[PDB]
Amino acid sequence: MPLVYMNIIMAFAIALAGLLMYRSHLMSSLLCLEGMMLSLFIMSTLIILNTHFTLANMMPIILLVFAACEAALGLSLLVMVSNTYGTDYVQNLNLLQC
Amino acid sequence: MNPIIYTTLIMTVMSGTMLVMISSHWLLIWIGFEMNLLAMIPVLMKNFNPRATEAATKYFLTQATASMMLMMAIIINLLYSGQWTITKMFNPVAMTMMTMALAMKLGLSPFHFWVPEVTQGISLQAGLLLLTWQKLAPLSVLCQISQSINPNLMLTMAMLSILIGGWGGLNQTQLRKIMAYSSIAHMGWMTAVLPYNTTMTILNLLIYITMTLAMFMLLIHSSATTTLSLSHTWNKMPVITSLMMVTLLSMGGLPPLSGFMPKWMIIQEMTKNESIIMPTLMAMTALLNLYFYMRLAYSSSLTMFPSTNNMKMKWQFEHTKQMKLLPTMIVLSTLVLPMTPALSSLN
Amino acid sequence: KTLLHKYSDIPEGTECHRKAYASTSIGGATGLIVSAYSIALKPPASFLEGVARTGRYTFTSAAIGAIFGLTSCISAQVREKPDDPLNYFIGGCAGGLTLGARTRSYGIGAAACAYMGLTAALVKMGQLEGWQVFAEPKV
Amino acid sequence: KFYIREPPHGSPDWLKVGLTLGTSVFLWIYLIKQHKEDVLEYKRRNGLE
Amino acid sequence: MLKIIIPTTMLLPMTWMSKHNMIWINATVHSLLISLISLSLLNQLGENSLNFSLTFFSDSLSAPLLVLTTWLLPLMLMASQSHLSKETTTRKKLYITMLILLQLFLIMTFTATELILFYILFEATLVPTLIIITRWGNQTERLNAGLYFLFYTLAGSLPLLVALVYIQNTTGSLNFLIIHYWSHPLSNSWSNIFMWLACIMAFMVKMPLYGLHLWLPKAHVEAPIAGSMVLAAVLLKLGGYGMMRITTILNPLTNYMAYPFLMLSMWGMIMTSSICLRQTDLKSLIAYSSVSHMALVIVAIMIQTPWSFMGATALMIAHGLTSSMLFCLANTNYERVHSRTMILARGLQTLLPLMATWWLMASLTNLALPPSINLIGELFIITASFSWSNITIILMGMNMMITALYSLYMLITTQRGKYTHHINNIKASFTRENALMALHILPLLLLTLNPKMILGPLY
Amino acid sequence: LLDLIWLETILPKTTSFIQMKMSIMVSNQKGLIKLYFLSFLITIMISMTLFNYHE
Amino acid sequence: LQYGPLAFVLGERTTRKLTETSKVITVDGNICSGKGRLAREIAEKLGLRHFPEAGIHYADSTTGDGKPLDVQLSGNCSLEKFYDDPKSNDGNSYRLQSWLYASRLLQYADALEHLLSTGQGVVLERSIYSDFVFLEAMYRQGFIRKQCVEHYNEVKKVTACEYLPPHVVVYVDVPVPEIQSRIQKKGNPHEMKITAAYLQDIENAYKKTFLPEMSEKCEVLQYSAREAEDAEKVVEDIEYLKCDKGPWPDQDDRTFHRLRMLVQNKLEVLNYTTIPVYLPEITIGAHQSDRVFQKFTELPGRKYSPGYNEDVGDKWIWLK
Amino acid sequence: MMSGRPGRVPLQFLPNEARSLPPPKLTDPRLVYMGFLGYCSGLIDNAIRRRPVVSAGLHRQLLYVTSFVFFGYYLLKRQDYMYALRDHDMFAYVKSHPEDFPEKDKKTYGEILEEFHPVR
Amino acid sequence: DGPEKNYEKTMAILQIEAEKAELRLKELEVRRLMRARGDGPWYQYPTIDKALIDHSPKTTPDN
Ligand SMILES: Nc1nc2c(ncn2[C@@H]2O[C@H](COP(=O)(O)OP(=O)(O)OP(=O)(O)O)[C@@H](O)[C@H]2O)c(=O)[nH]1
Q1: I want to staple F31 with a disulfide (CB 3.0 to 4.6 A). Which of A97, B333, E314, G33 is the partner?
Q2: CB C32 within 8 A of CB C17
Q3: Where along the sequence do coiled-coil regions lie (chain I) (predicted)?
């Protein structure tokens, strides 16, 4: 388990940490969401290439197919929250507190 | 939303959940979750109220985070095992990552502050679909991987759910909010028995599905969303709220109503596993769930509440909608205790 | 969680300083958890008050841990009897009054004694008996 | 007659009700025949008679 | 026992599709017929309990309670006729359904074979009474009354469930016959104390016991009259029937941990009887009286002597007939005066001759004149307690003296004295409530002639 | 003093108040998403390592 | 088959029949301004159906034979208390307006069902966007306090946003001194008691809030009484109008599916007429509501859902 | 306790192997109770739909009871099959593993020292 | 009826419940050891099937 595995695993942790610390931006939040996807794609690519799991080389592709699909969903949701509330800071949508 | 697109949108949700319960490959299980999330977000914001947008939004970030963590926990399992099959997880960190990864989809432990107001903002129709159908998929994954589960973590997940769910419901008026905390309370009950006997949580799931279904489409018929709005239904529809008493009592587990069958049968199983202190605990803290059930029962028809003069022509008109299996759902949700040994059909 | 087993590593009664320190650490550690949540979901206003809130909860929990530490070892020493539910019971207003004194009030403090009184008695019961909480699946 | 507009269930739907008895007898004689053949399947599986 | 179960559940369709005015006549007549059929259950062998079926069995303890329930059911039917006239027919049938459902659960509870089946219908009685107490009550507080009555019983019920299912995994069965026949000594291990405890507070919370009784004054004084009798007459005794059952296995633990409840009770009735003497509401006295009378029963069961068990059974049945009478008696006065204040309507003998009698021996049975079964149960407790400890005598002897003190006090403060001249609505006493008291009292003297049928299986 | 002042204060009202008092702090959530997911992060972190549920 | 989502899936559309002939119109005239004559005159010649002004008992016509039910069971209020003594603590005045509000909800609702299931336009006498005119005139004349008034708009906004304004309307203009003479000329004894300032308050609200805010939702056709008695020019201009400005063209079939779905079932149409707001003129006593709800039950037909009441016929119940 | 036992064909309600078991009797109280559930469901249907409860449309009512008994019947046949399987692996495993379930001799009451706790 | 009613009825009832009692205790331990050892008809958790493996000659000789 060489150091490149450490780099991208520790990377995904900061993607997890980055997502879980929304400061003032939904768009920057979605950035960290797609950020997670890099490390998962990159680690998955390293795994099935190292192990010569040739039939499983499709798995990183199918990750990406369902990757941007969420990415489109996030921005489409971001379209209306910014459209009808003006901005994208995740603090002005607290009307559901009650 | 046009009717035809709505149907295909629903079918995608059912297909997404069905993909989870039939696939043997971890990637496909993740895909089934992804399709389930993708087809559901439009369903929540069907009416396009301002509330539904962030209600659907809070759904998205929570479950996307859960899906991404689930994908990561899958990847480590592949790294240390080279397997995609749903048998068990050969890295303890991989398992200890999926429990919360699946928990936020279920909404059990403090990964639950999304459940109340996502139920509140969205309509009653999708609220029913959210709290009943969206739990078969994550629970099905848990049932398959039930072998390699850290009992200390999984039990704490459920114990926290019962305490918070019961405690939170005591301070809710909006009927959807109380249902969410009540659902969270039942979340712990099903998941507490998960490590010991997976047949039991299936039984509790089936009973809870009937409880939440029958309760909700009674709320749909009553066309009420807050406790005060429900109160007036005694003036118009006395039988609906009178039936709502028995379902509320059953939902609280007050026997011999059908709602006792999970709470009873579960307790019997864990005492077989020398677990005694914890079963006594949820027996105690199921009572706070019962509290706001009776308060709902008191406010609905156990005590007739002040009405509104605008109800005359309301009595002049009957419902045109046609809830089906409602007469059936009440029967299973109230009186199936004599057929308790039927749990062996699941086994 | 190794620090939790450190309580069982040192036998009761003896190492009264160590037992008090162990429970003080157990209380202080648990104090960090609740403060970390409370500082999170309950909104702060500044860094100064955030640690001030952290200090308050850590102070109570560490103090609650400590006194239960002393009361346990001294009771097992004055009576020279380790196995005693009362040994943990006298931690009742030991914890209750101090927690009701950290936020000085007779209502919370006096009403507290019993609640962790039998709880401390009950955890001692499982210490002596074979009671398990998170029992693994036997059947 | 009282309701001037044709009530939504003013008259029976002879298609709907006629189906209802039509299927119900099916539900019975299936169960009746199934109960018998299960009994015949009994007495020779274990050689009861 | 389905010869009683089947007709009892058959009362539901008959009462639910009868005519808008025949519901009272039909329900009363056939419930009485069920009582006559239930009278055949008085037959008991030497010691073999009547084992009708696998899931149903009865002995000399279950049947007297069984007849008490069945005989009682027409009594609330006639009592409720007064204040249920101003109601719609559908809701009236709903009221009858709750009473019949309450009866049906009671018969299954007493005739249950194993403890878990007994537990299911035992607790199941909470639901019919919860609707009765809350829906058909009279005052704002009834909402707080239902929660107090529900949670109190449930708070103790759940620990018993955990202990009961634990019995099945350890002993192998929960059937009462096997448990008593396969009875084994219970060790004094620290777990076994809680094992003993979890099977106790469920029965004593609804007894009620001193301290854990506050639901009793908060429900009986506040429930509708029909629910008031069944609560006091039988529902409290559900703990008694269970405790004679559960004590067959919980030995020899009872020697030690009876103490914290014994003098909790022993100081209890004397304390409670003192509260009865100084009440302000009528129904509050009888409710506080009921726990006082129930308190000696707690000592009777716990002391574990054959004489006390016979005394427990006799006092159990005698108190049910009594407490039902006084609660009915208070209802009669409350209806005309629209309140329950004691000194509100003192001095009514001059206007209520037959009532003044119905006060007279009902209180005397509360004083327990000899040879009423109240003393036969009470005196047997005394002899058993004295054999246990001589110093016992002063306490409950003083209690039955302060019991005597109040038990004439409402007689003085309701019948003795001068009428209130502003009151002018005390009409001629209707035969309905009048005959209701007759059906209450005559079985008491009839059972006084042959008490040998109500001392339980230990006779 | 004994019955109507202490008994209902020694068991029913205390437990009812305890649920009453802290049901508020559970349910008085302002709804900030940043605060919700921050609690997720702490729960995620203390799940392992600190509580060592992975060990 | 009733129009549900199944029909739309089958292809049942209403935009195909929604044409220039589907004009839902109503003559919003003053009190005794001849608006009913003008409305019916439009009806005969334009081919449109006539909806008489939905009164307190129009809902009784929507449910069953149509005989006006008892006042206590069909509104709890009546019109004579309005006109004779329009000041009392019982608040019959607003109970009229609150009840009369829901009547025009149905009157417009049945107007929809006519021209979305057939495409044939209708004629009414005033409509939902006329009830506030009376209520605004109610407050200025000292009838019922503003707490009812401020609740009125809250209820009005949540029972009309889903509702689409009509195609056109007609405002008949009759001078207010003449109207006071007209009401005095008819001889209805309740018409004598009417304050003269009430009529001009109706005229003011007609040309202060209704006509201005209506202009961008339907065409202004303000016609004087001298322009009202002639029944032709009031309808040639309707044909010579454009029906361009307004939200009607931009309502595709999916809006019409949403529209007819909500208006097919009245229960959610007036679900927000019974807001849990307790008011002196609206909050019936628990006992009073209970008996009154019972009182509604002994009435024939009003025991089971329509088509099941054996008391008024409905044979073959054991199969229905 | 059974989804992992060998030979368990998935998604197969009643195995052909299960036909060797006694079919549930038609009078079976478990079965007739499920018929009552259909009867009760019919009455609930007319209550919400505002219909003459008991005397309302029998075809809607009679369908409910007829449906419930049927799905009740196969559920009861599956009931005993699984219980029989529980009792089949019961004794085969007991015979296969005899040493962990030893036979207990007889040590009759006349010889046990069991004491009598004085109940005084 | 005579005491032979209740006497023989109890004999049947007591015996039948006795067999159930012992069987219940036997089931508890049988499941307990079957779950632990796993060498039993049930509790066999699924594993990878061996028919999926391909045995045909691959590209490299040494595998
Ligand atoms: N409160 C209230 N009263 C209404 C409403 N609609 C109609 N009315 C009353 O209906 C009654 C009759 O209306 P008018 O316009 O005078 O009827 P008309 O005499 O036929 O009128 P013309 O056709 O112009 O002659 C009046 O008392 C109106 O105030 C409504 O929505 N609310």
Answers
A1: A97
A2: no
A3: 4-36
